[PDB]
Design a protein around this ligand. Structure first.
Ligand code: T96
Ligand code: K
Ligand code: K
Length: 545
DNA sequence: TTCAAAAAGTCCCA
DNA sequence: ATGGGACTTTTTGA
């Protein structure tokens, strides 16, 4: 339950908040970490503070009580008035308390360390500087009892599929003094995710965001599957409302390339650009001026979105895939009438323009009438996981029989010509499905509304959607998940805007040629790339880029 | 009644 | 052992 932040990032965050502190004007700064753990941040704050006081001790001695401000009194003063920490783990607090004590009985100095839940603690005062690494807990791994508390007391940032660290953002902002500075490392996902919409609004309207370090899919925490960003903000009265954005260019770099993080940021491994916080909509589009010009051209030229012209839906959620999904060669399928069987694909089966031939079958068990008529299927296939099946939420509530699919959707949505795409991918892969394929939630589908079929064909749509232009276009606002993986979910895929002009026929014709080649047995992969290049030129010509 | 979001992902191997 | 790559379930709130 305790995660170790890399030292190069801790030093950067502590320096970010304290490097320009005027210790003469305010020799009582309150520095807080509300998830301090063992004190990765607070111990470094101690060292920075100690040098700051020691470097100015005689100036403080002259300006203030000359008996109080001595080098020998620095350690006591830091612990009494300057360093504050909170963590739920008692053992970590005890270790940090010993570590702070061992930085030097005389007078039994008091240390402002609290073992508590920072989201429930009544904070008696606000703080000049707040730093640290909050806990990240998603909607599956959070207790339902605790979530009721969060939904009630943190509703301005926490709803639906929000994360626990959203609330720490709210708590940090709320207990930050006017003119204070906060700097934390959190997941990057709130920058683009649908769940983070309210959190983005709360940050934008309550603090000035100084800097965003976006590591994208880089691995900052060793052996942890998370993507990180560093956010620095203040409550200073400033007319300037511009954010420094540092976005990594190579996700493969090692974080320890230089002695300091700021060396990495200034280097060629990162790009820098500014964003006007006042121009932020509910979406934070953090791109350089070239990409902004590119993105704005496409938005203005395209009169339709996919949502306007298409019906989107998520795939089947069986609730226990091992109970319902069988290899097409499994002998147990001889027990299942073919009326119950559906072709089943995974995200890896989706290529550009076409789906691989399916290798698995789904037992659409919702069409099994009662347990007596098809007892063999229930006893020998589905019943092998009956205990696990009965634990699904809708089985416990009686909504579903123990052998039904949890979310079987509508068969008629899948048994038609449609476009499918993987839910997580390195690139745009939109395919026309000709084979009535079913899939889990790792594959999304849509079909074109009847009233738009004479304006857009499936062949035209996969042509532009798979183009290099739309790959770049979608990734500008897409949710970056891990190294070389973006989310392709309807909440952003359906916002993709599309156009229709004089190039429609040739684009559609090029797409049909690609599909014809791809579906060949003696598939000529080489010519497909040439046709794709020609299509990209038409699309770039159409959009004037 | 029934939709769709959510990586402190998960798992394997060199 | 670790770091890197291939690939992706079902729980959950609304
Ligand atoms: N039951 C339950 C109780 C409390 C909360 C949330 N409130 C917390 N208040 C303070 N510190 C926390 C909290 N949660 C995790 N930490 C620590 O954050 C660090 C980051 O890894 C670690 O050292 C953790 O100990 C949620 C559920
Ligand atoms: K004095
Ligand atoms: K990562």
């Amino acid at each position: 339950g305790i995660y170790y932040t890399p030292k190069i990032i801790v030093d950067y965050i502590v320096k970010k908040t304290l490097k320009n502190h005027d210790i003469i004007k305010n020799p009582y700064p309150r520095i807080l970490d509300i998830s301090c753990g063992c004190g990765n941040f607070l111990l470094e704050v101690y060292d920075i503070l100690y040098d700051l006081f020691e470097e100015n001790i005689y100036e403080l001695k002259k300006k203030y009580d000359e008996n109080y401000w001595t080098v020998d009194n620095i350690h006591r003063h830091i612990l009494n008035y300057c360093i504050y920490g909170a963590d739920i783990d008692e053992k970590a607090i005890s270790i940090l308390k010993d570590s702070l004590t061992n930085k030097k009985d005389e007078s039994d100095i008091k240390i402002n360390l609290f073992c508590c839940d920072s989201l429930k603690k009544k904070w008696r005062y606000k703080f000049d500087y707040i730093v640290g690494n909050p806990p990240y807990i998603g909607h599956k791994k959070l207790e339902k009892k605790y979530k009721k508390f969060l939904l009630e007391k943190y509703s301005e940032v926490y709803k639906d599929k929000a994360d626990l660290y959203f609330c720490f953002y709210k708590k940090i902002i709320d207990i930050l003094k006017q003119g204070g500075i906060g700097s934390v490392i959190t997941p990057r996902y709130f920058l683009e995710s649908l769940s983070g919409k309210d959190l983005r609004e709360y940050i934008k309207s309550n603090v000035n965001v100084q800097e965003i370090v976006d590591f994208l899919g880089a691995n900052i925490f060793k052996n942890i599957g998370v993507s990180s960003c560093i956010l620095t903000f203040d409550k200073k009265k400033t007319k300037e409302t511009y954010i420094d954005v540092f976005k990594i260019k190579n996700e493969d770099i090692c974080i320890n390339k230089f002695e300091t993080l700021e060396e990495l940021l200034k280097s060629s491994k990162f790009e820098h650009f500014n964003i006007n916080q006042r121009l932020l909509s509910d979406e934070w589009i953090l791109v350089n001026k070239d990409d902004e010009t590119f993105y704005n051209k496409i938005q203005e030229k395209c009169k339709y979105s996919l949502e306007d012209i298409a019906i989107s839906f998520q795939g089947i959620i069986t609730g226990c895939d091992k109970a319902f999904i069988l290899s097409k060669d499994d002998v147990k399928l001889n027990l299942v009438d073919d009326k119950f069987l559906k072709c089943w694909i995974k995200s890896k089966n989706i290529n550009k323009y076409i789906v691989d031939k399916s290798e698995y079958r789904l037992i659409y068990s919702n069409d099994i009438d009662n347990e007596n008529t098809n007892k063999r299927i229930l006893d020998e296939i589905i019943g092998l996981y009956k205990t696990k099946l009965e634990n699904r939420r809708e089985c416990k509530s009686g909504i579903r029989k123990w052998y039904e699919l949890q979310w079987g959707r509508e068969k008629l949505f899948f048994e038609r010509k449609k476009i499918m795409y993987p839910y997580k991918s390195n690139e745009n892969r939109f395919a026309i499905d000709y084979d009535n394929n079913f899939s889990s939630a790792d594959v999304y589908s849509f079909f074109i509304k009847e009233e738009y079929l004479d304006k857009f064909s499936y062949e035209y749509l996969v042509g532009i959607l798979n183009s290099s232009v739309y790959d770049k276009y979608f990734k500008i606002t897409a949710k970056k998940m891990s190294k070389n993986i973006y989310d392709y979910y309807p909440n952003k895929v359906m916002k993709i805007r599309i156009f229709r002009d004089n190039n429609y026929e040739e684009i559609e014709n090029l797409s049909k040629q690609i599909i014809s080649i791809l579906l060949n047995k003696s598939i000529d992969k080489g010519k497909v790339e040439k046709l794709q290049i020609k299509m990209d030129n038409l699309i770039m010509d159409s959009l004037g880029i």
